[PDB]
Design a protein around this nucleic acid. Sequence first.
DNA 1: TGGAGAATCCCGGTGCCGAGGCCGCTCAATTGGTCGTAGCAAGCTCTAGCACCGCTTAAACGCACGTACGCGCTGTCCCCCGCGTTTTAACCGCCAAGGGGATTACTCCC
Length: 59
Amino acid sequence: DFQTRPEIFIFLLSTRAGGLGINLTTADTVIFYDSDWNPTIDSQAMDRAHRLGQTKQVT
DNA sequence: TGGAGAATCCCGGTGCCGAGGCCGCTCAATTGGTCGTAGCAAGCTCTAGCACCGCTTAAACGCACGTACGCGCTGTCCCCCGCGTTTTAACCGCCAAGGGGATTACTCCC
């Protein structure tokens, strides 16, 4: 759904269940409302956006 | 006695799902030796269980006889059954949820 249609603004996503898996490359912005103590997991989360096929500069 | 018709049975056909057998493996039953002890055995004590006698009188029995009560009979009526109608909720299927219990991560404390 999120990848299909640009009317959806925001994607709420838990850090561990949601950080690991598939591309989310029609986002452009990643907000850590809270940041994991293990920096790898925040890196995985950031790179669900910052990825091959990423549309725009990730902030 | 007959009959009609409903209700119960039987015969063969269909299919589905669970019973009966196969497979892999664990872990619980078996083999071997140890060691403690309890309960099997021999022995003594004296409890209390069984037997008998004799007496007392309360408890058991056989009988008379009255009447209280068990039982078959009669009448009624009411209320529970057999059957058609109306309706509701039990059953089935499919999706949701939540919860809880085991696991995994990450930090602080020792």
